[PDB]
Every structure is written in C-alpha cells, then in structure tokens.
Amino acid sequence: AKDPMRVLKYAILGLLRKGELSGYDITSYFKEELGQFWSAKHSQIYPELKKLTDEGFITFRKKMYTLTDSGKQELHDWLIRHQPIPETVKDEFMLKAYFISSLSRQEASDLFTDQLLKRKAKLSDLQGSYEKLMASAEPMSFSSPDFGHYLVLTKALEREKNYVSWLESILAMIDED
Amino acid sequence: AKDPMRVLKYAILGLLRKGELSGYDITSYFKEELGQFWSAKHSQIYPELKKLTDEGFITFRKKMYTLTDSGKQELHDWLIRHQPIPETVKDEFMLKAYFISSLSRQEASDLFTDQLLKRKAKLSDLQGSYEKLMASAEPMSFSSPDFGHYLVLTKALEREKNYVSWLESILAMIDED
Ligand SMILES: COc1cc(/C=C/C(=O)O)ccc1O
Ligand SMILES: COc1cc(/C=C/C(=O)O)ccc1O
The missing domain is CATH 1.10.10.10 (Winged helix-like DNA-binding domain superfamily/Winged helix DNA-binding domain)
Structure with missing residues (x-):
C-alpha cells in the first residue's frame, strides 16, 4: 500500500x-x-x-x-x-436523483429545491472570490501572473452555474404545467 | 476504521x-x-x-x-x-491549469487541446447513451419509470458540455487575437 x-x-x-x-x-x-x-x-x-x-x-x-x-x-x-x-466523482445527490421513483412529487420538489438553494449560495461565494481576484489592476490574459487562479475560479463558477441551471430545469419538470 | x-x-x-x-x-x-x-x-x-x-x-x-x-x-x-x-472533487487537470505559468503558450495550447478532444469524445459517448434511453416509446416526464435514469444522464451531458465550452473559451484566450 x-x-x-x-x-x-x-x-x-x-x-x-x-x-x-x-x-x-x-x-x-x-x-x-x-x-x-x-x-x-x-x-x-x-x-x-x-x-x-x-x-x-x-x-x-x-x-x-x-x-x-x-x-x-x-x-x-x-x-x-x-x-x-x-x-466520474461520486455525487451523492445524483444517486438520490437516480432513485427519485421512491419520492412523491412534493418530496422530489423539496429535495431538489434544497439542493438548488444550497448551490445558489455556493455560487454567490464563488462570485465573490472571482470579483476579489478581478479587482487587480492588470487586465486578465494568458500572460497575467494570476491566469492560473482565474482558470480554477472560472471553472468552478461555470460548474456551479451549470448545476443550478440543471436543477431549475428539473424543478420545472417536477412542476410541469 | x-x-x-x-x-x-x-x-x-x-x-x-x-x-x-x-x-x-x-x-x-x-x-x-x-x-x-x-x-x-x-x-x-x-x-x-x-x-x-x-x-x-x-x-x-x-x-x-x-x-x-x-x-x-x-x-x-x-x-x-x-x-x-x-x-469539490479533485480534478487533476484543474491542478495543472492552476500551475499553467510553468508552460509556454504552445505547451498550454497542447495540454488544453488534448483535454478538449478527450472531453468531446466522452460527450459523444454520453449523447449515445442518452439517445438510447430516449428511444423508449413513452414521452419523458416526472412520472416516467425512466425519470431517474434521465436525471443522471442529462446531468452528465450538461456537465461535459459545460467542460467542453469552458475549455474552448480558454483555448481562445491562449490563442488571443
Ligand atoms: C472561493 O474561492 C476560490 C474557489 C476556488 C475553487 C472552488 C471549487 O472548485 O469549488 C478556487 C479559487 C478561489 O479563490
Ligand atoms: C454512458 O451511459 C450512462 C452514463 C451515465 C453517467 C455518466 C457520468 O456521470 O459520467 C449515466 C447513465 C448512463 O446510461
């Protein structure tokens, strides 16, 4: 080992x-x-x-x-x-989603709404970190000393934005017209 | 333990x-x-x-x-x-991105282009699995027996699409006008 x-x-x-x-x-x-x-x-x-x-x-x-x-x-x-x-990294929430048949429409709505509110809060936190990085004077580019930090932060922002968007889409299906 | x-x-x-x-x-x-x-x-x-x-x-x-x-x-x-x-799950590629200052513009381009081609291929594979699921007769909805499978597959598709889009954005910055 x-x-x-x-x-x-x-x-x-x-x-x-x-x-x-x-x-x-x-x-x-x-x-x-x-x-x-x-x-x-x-x-x-x-x-x-x-x-x-x-x-x-x-x-x-x-x-x-x-x-x-x-x-x-x-x-x-x-x-x-x-x-x-x-x-793929184990995302326990997504295992729950896989087993959604074991929840009522309301239970599913409550589970997904909890996850959405949590992910929107995380996104707010990432956005704050991003604005802090971008408060530097030098415009961002490949040659910036901070380019690697920009890469990790923008990746995380895109990741969580995409999670939020996906959750909203599913909530709209749980709440179909 | x-x-x-x-x-x-x-x-x-x-x-x-x-x-x-x-x-x-x-x-x-x-x-x-x-x-x-x-x-x-x-x-x-x-x-x-x-x-x-x-x-x-x-x-x-x-x-x-x-x-x-x-x-x-x-x-x-x-x-x-x-x-x-x-x-956040450790994504080793993103640790490399964090340390991009240790690569030339060409080295960075080659690293990111390798990752993009790999992620586009994975996305093709997910799209195939998605089309297979959706070949069922019953239209997809919350009440479908296959809704949980749909949830995991659409999440994965969105995830990889978003990774691809992010990589393309970074490649365009590495290749700035
Ligand atoms: C909140 O501040 C930061 C967050 C990250 C990445 C987060 C993640 O991948 O979840 C990276 C740099 C930061 O300065
Ligand atoms: C390729 O087929 C599948 C892939 C997944 C998920 C993949 C992932 O999260 O990376 C889920 C169901 C499938 O039928």
Missing part, C-alpha cells in the same frame, strides 16, 4: 514554481484558495514536504523551501503528461 | 426499490449505467449485499434479493436527509 499523502505531491511542487515559500505560506495556500479544489488534510502537508525534500525535488534553507532542478523536471513531466479522463 | 464497501449501501438499497433482483442483475447495473457515476470495485458488491441482509435491510429467497420494511425506511430517510454540499 502507498501513502495517501502522496496526493499533495504536485500541489506542493507547483506552489513552489515561482520561487521560495515558507511552510506557513504553503499551509496558507491549502487553508485558502488551493484547499477549495485540492483539499489537504492539514496533518499531511509537512510530512509530504519532508518526503519531497528527502527525494531531492525540494530543498530548504524559518525553513524556506525551493524547487530543485529535479523538482522542476518532475513538475514539468506531470504537467505535459496526457492521462485518460478519470472516473 | 470503517469498511470502504459501505459506499455501496444506498446504491444497493435503491436498486431494489422497485422489486426483487438477483445478484447478477445488481452486479449488471454496476457494470453498466450505475458504474458510470457510482463506481463499485466489483469485489465489494457481494460482501456489501451480505452485510445489508445481515443488518435486516434486505432479505433473500439463484438468490433473489428484496428490501425489507426496514430497508425501505433506511432508503427513505437517506433520500430526504439534507446534507451540506460536499468538498
């Missing part, structure tokens, strides 16, 4: 791509933006940092961490590797 | 909601439609079936399995329970 903390490997190497960071800084990215789409069990971060140092991908000199040439190559190879798209 | 096979519990109870099924039938739903969004390690199915029988949620009389009144209540309580939306 392999160590579950290995899931943090490329997240850690990537965070270091632009230059040195303290463990505090790294831990901070996980507590903030990076933890929203690549959650860490915070107990795993320092141990994985140690493993990557010991494997020669990261060095340190507070301790300040940087990529080695080996680390840079390790991150580059992973970025450019093509992998099949993975298996 | 709890048993990972417990992830199959409500999938199994739900499959039995409309009446008796053989283990072959249950295994078949997992190999086909249900495995596409709620994947089972096929080694876990029979053991979980046994656990649910022994817990009194399912009975058997080939062995043919049915929900007990307890099982029906167990499925009902889960269906109507409201849970917070869970944490």
